[PDB]
């Protein structure tokens, strides 16, 4: 009679997503997480002291903000009792944070967990590898941590090259990629104008040197992205290639946070949750085609939760590259009309640590807006991993 | 679902000193041979491993996701996924706990979990290089020195130890007594061969040769009370915490193979130990060293043990003063604690240590023919973590 | 041998502010167009130039030997050799003196000489990168901030100015009076077109456009007594030296064509000026600003002038306080000194300035129809240099 | 009746030459100049207050020791009245310093000048060019100042490549280069053993962290350099090339200083000078074959002083590369038995700022040892310059 508690989600919020060198240029990951943590708890039906753990996914962790989760909890003014830990599973980090929170709740390790992800790519440092013991002679390299994290650590090829591998494998055309890219911006712009993201977005106040900036709207979507402009871009990873800056996701800044608790705890509190978690799955694939990860992850997960793919009402499949998304779409034979319905990574941006949580936030709110139930959120991961999360809106 | 968790292998590298044997080894490189040996001993083939989970404090973007990269570098199949955990000093212990959670829920059947830190090879960082320093001198930041500084209060871990010194009225002399004990017991354990079975030798390919690193290099054979008493305070002007009574900066990895009891029985394996419980407690970061006290008390309640039921404890010595605060607060029996030394004598490769002390505890329980163990450690940022095990 | 030295051209770039118009221009790039224009005006073809000598404070190993590299980059024949001089703030004036020495001895017949500084594009340095920092944080050093710090006493030039303030009992208010004058007279000179002939416009190729930089950008049209009086001391807590009464950090080049009087006559050229003498004096580095006093006195003896014989003087304002010490020590007639502004109003691109003030003095003597000029400046490290000229 | 004073040299001393990362690893240029300045003045027949100027040639100047000459004068304890300035003419910097001193003395600008050169290559810094205004994105370069100074700033080829240009032009063989290289070490070792350098060398005391090291002997010459070892080395600048690390000069540390004064001042003081300067010359050539500089410089200078080449009793022609030396030897048809008779740059090292002064120090002492009169010292210069100095031992 050992019990496994159902996991429900009582709040789901995010910062707007900044562009590289944009509104969040001078914000650290802890600074970017803090206001979102604060608003999540305010909406989530709990006081800070009731939070058992903060778990954050973070790709480019910083030693000056060791343990991003614990540091952000304290910086947010939460009691010293609110512990935290930080997760690195590359692009899926923010989704793994939610899964790890669910595990703690299912087991009764925690009753309430605040979980999500953050990435502040714009403020990420440069590194010197030979400074400690010396370069001795000849020129050295000062390494961009953002550019490093985009390079596979075993094969030393960029994520964009792994995308071109999928282009060749799945015979994906430049037109197909650019159609998806245009769609991503177009649907994002429409959602923004229609106010679809108003509820889920937490404005960030940036204290600059001589003023304060209130950042409240996603800044990656571009009205000037047209079929014409996309077709004129040069290939970014291979000569005679088709993956470009225009049909690839951006480098971006953002945070996203959910409040999760046992269903019994929500009943105790008299709270109507937004959604429940019904399952999650992780699958490993060839790092050289890491973008295909969501296919086996989704298949594995559907088997576990006893859904057909057709049962899903909406899906969020992160667009790391349009080509990568297209490979997943072709492999699973997805109905695009149910997928990324307000855009995805190409139009909205890809703050990597954040994204796995960001797409979950967006999915929850869009299911509710449409009055639909079943959602799948899934994304590829550098290093060759796919992760999928299965939810039901309440 | 709802499985019990057992441990079928528990191994570690020897612990290198800063700039020592492992000077030029990266965290992935240091994890790989220990991952391979653990799986070999743990009764499984690599394809049977569901997840590798590693605790790592100073993660590197050139080895993104240390656990997954190490799994691949170790030659494990692409199906063997991984993720990496940062809970500061307790990272390696949290990795074990996270593995246990997956196994308890039936998320995974077999998990390889532990921790690694390669402090000697950690980089330097420039924070103003991207957008420009503009004018005046800047700082090139040591990632090791950063990770030892509290990120909210901007004081070194050693200063948080001096806070405990003042709070618990701990003498310089008792700190040095504990430091001497740490080296002395470590040296005795090394001499007696207690660590022979748990240590995995590391081969380092140098310019003109290969070196085989097989023995812990931090313990000092000629350390003495007189030497310790002569040292200058390291963190406060009239202070008592010194380089001699503080843990070192060190390099090391440590790995366990965990699986469900069901899976062990199905494979006909006799596990070394089972996990009975685990607990985490948050405290004031300014006295982060006390973390193990509430964590242990919290965990004892959960597993329904009395403190006295424990046969052996490992409480990491981040600083002798910090250990002493815990000893005093819980009124521990020193003769059952850190019986073969701890961080001061053996070193503290931070990401690794939470797993390292668990490895050591498992093997010492077995050596003594004892059952119940507690492993626990403080965590920069104000956290205590505790793991409760029973040797089989 | 034993020739008289005349000057047939004297030109300069406009002076940019730090991070301003010349932000992305290197010293060679900034010297080139001014070298080319000087030679064009100076009555010679490039192949007739025997040597290019440039004063340069923050030399770069990627442009080794600034003078020779600039000569080549300017398209001058391979036969046109060069060398580069560091005598701190007086570097550009020393280049002129060294040119004169070569011409006097018949070592060279025609020399192009001057100075350059591109402070905005100067690099940062790491001193421990080669052999390693090992542990703890390091410094990434601003070469501009380094060059402004005395290398023996490790105090900023601004602090040496505060030493003169105390020594000569100079008020904050008189410093600000001089600072206001410097901007005011510079602005008037700019408005009246006094600098039109001497300035060589610089074209900067930016990402999407070309910019033509033709006017000095340091003078502040809206500077006032009230604004200056409100500023905080920059170098001492109860101090009087401020950012407003100190020279700026700036970018600029300045170049003269010199030759023997014999050579000028042979070429039928009418020179702008002749060099009558020059002098160098060493003083206490802690009050380096006073250098011009002994240098001027020493030189006056050599050329057999009285101070009163001078029609105009240029005494570089490194700091208003430093200028004031010189004015007081020599009992100068302010109405004959820095008549169109100086370093506070116009800027101080250090390698360039010793040549820049000479260019300016030559043209202002001519404009006023006056003969005798003295140009002089202080030098970090405790040196004063003075140049004595007669307009023709 | 304007007078031009004869220039005489009353002292000529040098540090031993350190190897890269060797005995002088942790010594700055000012530190390395100081003891040599001090000993020079002690031998030169003047008190420090009588010194009018210190002039030093220095290739890799440092902003933390601005104006190396003035800084070293003050650090040596010389009075504040002793001014100084620093010269950059690449490899000939140290020789130009002596020439500039001679000019001041000839003109009566100074009566006594201390002049020479210094280079501390081992302690030279690394530079970042994009740190001030930012790298923005992607990896950058941390630049070795030593490696930069060895690269031509117009053509961006290493000095070693300009040497290979001369190899091809003058049809110089690998054997010829290696014979010169072996000779350079062999003659240096012999001179050292015979005590030829005892008088001219000033020992340097290096204060290391836990001891003091007294460095008193040139450390570049190698007894293990053999014809066999040289022939086995790989080409360093061109595939199928012949310039190697073994037949090229090293990277080295050293200082060298002369005391110069008017002949009348020496007579006044009752001093017997070591030597007089009779002339000097500078010639510009193609930077791509900079190594040939000494040929036109020597020819130009001989015309000025009315010497035949045959009149010279000894020559020092710096060996930047054996190949470069060989081109000069072939062009001028030199008698090698009169040239570099105790070795040169390949065996002894090449601390670049120092070398032009170093070879002059060595020449003066060897002329005196052999009881000979006429000397020529000359060297090539990166950027395409040759410089020559003509002296008579007294
Ligand atoms: K919400
Ligand atoms: K084992
Ligand atoms: K976990
Ligand atoms: K002119
Ligand atoms: K000169
Ligand atoms: K001598």
Of B142, B156, B235, B248, which to mutate for an interface test with C (greatest number of C Cβ within 10 Å)? B142
Q: CA B281 to CA B386: how far, in whole Å?
A: 9
- DSSP string for residues in B9-65: EEEEPPPEETTSTTTT--HHHHHHHHHHHHHHHTT--GGG--EEEEE-SS--GGG-S
Q: Is B226 exposed, middle or buried (0-12, 13-18, 19+ CB in 10 A)?
A: exposed
Q: CA A378 to CA A308: how far, in whole Å?
A: 16
| CA B200 to chain CA mean position, Å | 16
- DSSP string for residues in B141-205: EEHHHHHTB-TTT--BHHHHHHHHHHHHT--HHHHHHHHHHHHHHHHHHHHHTTTTTTB--EEEE
Q: CA D87 to CA B194: how far, in whole Å?
A: 67
Phi, psi of B348 (to 5 degrees): -135, 75
Q: What residues does A213 pair with on adjacent strands? A: A206
Structure tokens at C247: 């020279």
- How far apart are the CA of C82 and the centre of ligand 4, in A? 21
Handedness of CA C229, C232, C235, C240 (dihedral sign): positive
Find all residues with CB under 8 Å of A134, minimum gap 6, and list them. Answer: C129, C130, C131, C132
Phi, psi of C160 (to 5 degrees): -65, -30
- Contact between D40 and D261 under an 8 Å Cβ cutoff? The reply is no
Q: CA C371 to CA C273: how far, in whole Å?
A: 9
Q: CA A319 to CA A326: how far, in whole Å?
A: 9
Q: CA B5 to CA A301: how far, in whole Å?
A: 24
Q: CA B143 to CA B122: how far, in whole Å?
A: 7
Q: CA C342 to CA A310: how far, in whole Å?
A: 80
Nearest to C309 by CA among C388, C387, C367, C384: C388
- DSSP string for residues in D209-238: SS-EEEE-S-----TT--HHHHHTPPPSSS
Q: CA D361 to CA D218: how far, in whole Å?
A: 14
| CA D14 to chain CA mean position, Å | 10
Q: CA C270 to CA C251: how far, in whole Å?
A: 31
Distances (CA, A) of C48 to A292, A314, B349, C37: 70, 80, 69, 15
Place of tokens 């941590």: A145
Q: CA D194 to CA A38: how far, in whole Å?
A: 82
CA trace torsion D40, D42, D46, D48 (10° rounding): 80
Which sequence spans correspond to the domains of chain A? Answer: 1-128+196-277, 143-195+278-394
Give chain A positions within 8 Å (CB) of D60: none
Residues having C-beta closer than 5 Å to ion ligand 1: A 11-12, 43
Separation in Å, CA of B175 to nearest CA in chain A: 27
Domain B1-126+194-275 and domain B141-193+276-392, same fold? Reply is yes
CATH topology of domain B1-126+194-275: Peroxisomal Thiolase; Chain A, domain 1 (3.40.47)
Q: CA D4 to CA A320: how far, in whole Å?
A: 79
For strands B124-126 and B138-142, give the pairing: antiparallel
- Contact between C273 and C309 under an 8 Å Cβ cutoff? The reply is no
- Contact between A86 and A56 under an 8 Å Cβ cutoff? The reply is yes
Q: Resolution of this PDB entry, in A?
A: 1.7
Handedness of CA D65, D70, D71, D73 (dihedral sign): positive
Distances (CA, A) of B200 to A385, B12, B16, B35, B309: 29, 6, 13, 10, 32
Structure tokens at D389: 């100095």
Distances (CA, A) of C137 to A204, C133, C134, D233: 32, 8, 9, 40
Q: Establish how many alpha carbons lie within 13 A of residue B47's alpha carbon, considering only the half-sphere containing its beta carbon.
A: 0
CB contact under 8 A, B133 and D131: yes
What one-character DSSP code corresponds to residue C225? H
Q: CA D238 to CA D164: how far, in whole Å?
A: 8
- Contact between B204 and B210 under an 8 Å Cβ cutoff? The reply is yes
Structure tokens at B68: 């997954």
Q: CA D161 to CA D382: how far, in whole Å?
A: 12
Q: Establish how many alpha carbons lie within 13 A of residue C79's alpha carbon, considering only the half-sphere containing its beta carbon.
A: 10
Q: CA C332 to CA C314: how far, in whole Å?
A: 11
CB contact under 8 A, D71 and C151: yes
Structure tokens at D80: 């504040």
CATH topology of domain B141-193+276-392: Peroxisomal Thiolase; Chain A, domain 1 (3.40.47)
Superfamily of segment(s) D143-195+278-394: Thiolase/Chalcone synthase (3.40.47.10)
- Contact between C372 and C383 under an 8 Å Cβ cutoff? The reply is no
Q: Which of D82, D125, D282 sits opposite C282 (nearest CB)?
A: D82
Give the 3-state secondary structure of residue B317: coil
Structure tokens at A228: 């014409």
A209 touches chain C (CB under 8 A): no
Helical packing angle, A68-75 and A29-43, nearest 10°: 60
Of D22, D88, D295, which to mutate for an interface test with C (greatest number of C Cβ within 10 Å)? D88
Phi, psi of D275 (to 5 degrees): -165, 165
Q: Which of C18, C140, C249 sits opposite B138 (nearest CB)?
A: C140
Nearest to D177 by CA among D135, D139, D233: D233
Structure tokens at A177: 């990629």
Phi, psi of C123 (to 5 degrees): -80, 175
Handedness of CA B193, B197, B202, B208 (dihedral sign): positive
- Contact between A17 and A253 under an 8 Å Cβ cutoff? The reply is yes
Q: CA B173 to CA A361: how far, in whole Å?
A: 55
Q: CA A260 to CA A103: how far, in whole Å?
A: 11
Helices (H), ranges, C23-148: 27-41, 66-73, 91-105, 143-147
Residue B95 host element (H or E): helix B91-105
Nearest to B57 by CA among B118, B127, B141, B124: B118
Find all residues with CB under 8 Å of A375, minimum gap 6, and list them. Answer: A275, A312, A313, A314, A315, A316, A363, A364, A367, A390, A391, A392, A393
Helices (H), ranges, A134-282: 145-149, 159-170, 174-194, 227-231, 263-269
- Contact between C336 and C359 under an 8 Å Cβ cutoff? The reply is no
Distances (CA, A) of A341 to A191, A220, A256, A338: 9, 17, 19, 6
Give the 3-state secondary structure of residue D50: helix
Distance from first CA to last CA of chain A, Å, rounded? 27
Separation in Å, CA of A143 to nearest CA in chain D: 5
Q: CA A77 to CA D26: how far, in whole Å?
A: 49
Q: CA B201 to CA B210: how far, in whole Å?
A: 12
Distances (CA, A) of D58 to C55, C57, D116: 14, 13, 9
Distances (CA, A) of C197 to A78, C41, C364, D217: 68, 11, 11, 59
Handedness of CA C63, C65, C71, C72 (dihedral sign): negative
Distance from first CA to last CA of chain C, Å, rounded? 22
Q: How many CB atoms lie within 10 A of CB D264?
A: 14
Q: CA C93 to CA A385: how far, in whole Å?
A: 67
What one-character DSSP code corresponds to residue A50? G
CB contact under 8 A, A20 and D143: no
For strands D140-144 and C312-315, give the pairing: unpaired
Find all residues with CB under 8 Å of B279, minimum gap 6, and list them. Answer: B295, B296, B298, B299, B302, B385, B386
- Contact between D184 and D343 under an 8 Å Cβ cutoff? The reply is yes
D149 touches chain C (CB under 8 A): yes
Numbers of helices and strands, H then E, in chain A: 12, 14
Nearest to C284 by CA among D70, D259, A71, D390: D70
Return the biggest CA–CA distance within chain B: 68
Q: CA D206 to CA D212: how far, in whole Å?
A: 6
Give the 3-state secondary structure of residue A336: helix
D1-128+196-277 placed in CATH 2.40.128.20:
no
Find all residues with CB under 8 Å of D175, minimum gap 6, and list them. Answer: none
Q: CA C16 to CA C254: how far, in whole Å?
A: 13
Structure tokens at B118: 């390669």
Give the 3-state secondary structure of residue C318: coil
Of D122, D140, D148, which to mutate for an interface test with A (greatest number of A Cβ within 10 Å)? D140
Q: CA A318 to CA C159: how far, in whole Å?
A: 58
Please list the active-site residues of C: 89, 348, 378
A137 touches chain D (CB under 8 A): yes
Q: What residues does A27 pair with on adjacent strands? A: none
- How far apart are the CA of B188 and the centre of ligand 2, in A? 21
Give the 3-state secondary structure of residue A322: helix
- Contact between A388 and A298 under an 8 Å Cβ cutoff? The reply is yes
- Contact between C55 and C75 under an 8 Å Cβ cutoff? The reply is no
Q: CA B377 to CA A298: how far, in whole Å?
A: 39
Q: CA B11 to CA B355: how far, in whole Å?
A: 9
Q: CA C241 to CA C233: how far, in whole Å?
A: 5
Q: CA C316 to CA C344: how far, in whole Å?
A: 9
Residue B330 host element (H or E): helix B320-330
Find all residues with CB under 8 Å of A232, minimum gap 6, and list them. Answer: none
| CA B117 to chain CA mean position, Å | 9
- Contact between C74 and C36 under an 8 Å Cβ cutoff? The reply is yes
Please list the active-site residues of A: 91, 350, 380
Q: Is C221 exposed, middle or buried (0-12, 13-18, 19+ CB in 10 A)?
A: exposed
Give the 3-state secondary structure of residue C345: helix
Nearest to C110 by CA among C33, C8, C212: C8
Q: What residues does D85 pair with on adjacent strands? A: D55
Place of tokens 């290391």: D208
Q: How many CB atoms lie within 10 A of CB A86?
A: 31
Q: CA B128 to CA C385: how far, in whole Å?
A: 39
C127 touches chain D (CB under 8 A): yes
For strands D53-57 and D204-207, give the pairing: unpaired
Q: Establish how many alpha carbons lie within 13 A of residue B65's alpha carbon, considering only the half-sphere containing its beta carbon.
A: 33
Q: CA C142 to CA A186: how far, in whole Å?
A: 47
- Contact between C291 and C378 under an 8 Å Cβ cutoff? The reply is yes
């Amino acid at each position: 009679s050992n019990a496994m508690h159902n996991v429900v989600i009582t709040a789901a919020v995010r910062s707007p997503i900044g562009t590289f060198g944009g509104a969040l240029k001078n914000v650290t990951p802890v600074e970017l997480a803090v206001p979102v943590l604060q608003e999540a708890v305010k909406r989530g039906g709990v006081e800070p002291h009731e939070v058992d753990e903060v778990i954050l996914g973070h790709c480019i962790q910083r030693t000056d903000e060791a343990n991003t989760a614990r540091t952000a909890a304290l910086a947010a003014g939460f009691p010293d009792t609110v512990t935290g830990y930080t997760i690195q599973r590359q692009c899926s980090s923010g989704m793994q944070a939610i899964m790890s929170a669910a595990m703690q709740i299912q087991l009764g390790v925690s009753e309430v967990v605040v979980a999500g992800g953050v990435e502040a790519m714009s403020s990420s440092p440069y590194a010197l590898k030979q400074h400690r013991w010396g370069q001795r002679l000849q020129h050295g390299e000062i390494r961009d941590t953002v550019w490093e994290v985009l390079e596979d650590p075993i094969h030393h090829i960029m994520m964009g090259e792994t995308a071109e591998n999928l282009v060749e494998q799945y015979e994906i055309t430049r037109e197909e990629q650019d159609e998806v890219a245009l769609r991503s911006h177009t649907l994002a712009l429409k959602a923004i104008e229609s106010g679809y993201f108003d509820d889920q977005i937490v404005p960030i106040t940036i204290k600059e040197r001589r003023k304060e900036v209130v950042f409240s709207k996603d800044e990656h979507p571009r009205a000037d992205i047209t079929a014409e402009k996309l077709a004129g871009l040069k290939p970014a990873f291979r000569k005679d290639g088709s993956v470009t800056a225009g049909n690839a996701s951006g480098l971006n800044d953002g945070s996203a946070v959910l409040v999760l608790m046992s269903e019994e705890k929500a009943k105790e509190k008299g709270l109507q949750p937004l959604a429940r978690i019904v399952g999650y799955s992780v699958a490993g694939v060839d790092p050289k085609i890491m973008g295909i990860g969501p296919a086996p992850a989704i298949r594995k997960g559907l088997e576990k939760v006893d859904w057909s793919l057709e049962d899903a009402d909406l899906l969020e499949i992160n667009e790391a590259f349009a080509a990568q998304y297209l490979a997943v779409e072709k492999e699973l034979d997805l109905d695009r009309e149910k997928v990324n319905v307000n855009g995805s990574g190409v139009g909205l941006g890809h703050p990597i640590g954040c994204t796995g949580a960001r797409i979950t936030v967006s999915l929850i709110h869009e299911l509710k807006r449409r009055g639909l139930e079943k959602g799948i959120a899934s994304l590829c991961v550098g290093g060759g991993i796919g992760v999928a999360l299965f939810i039901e809106a309440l």
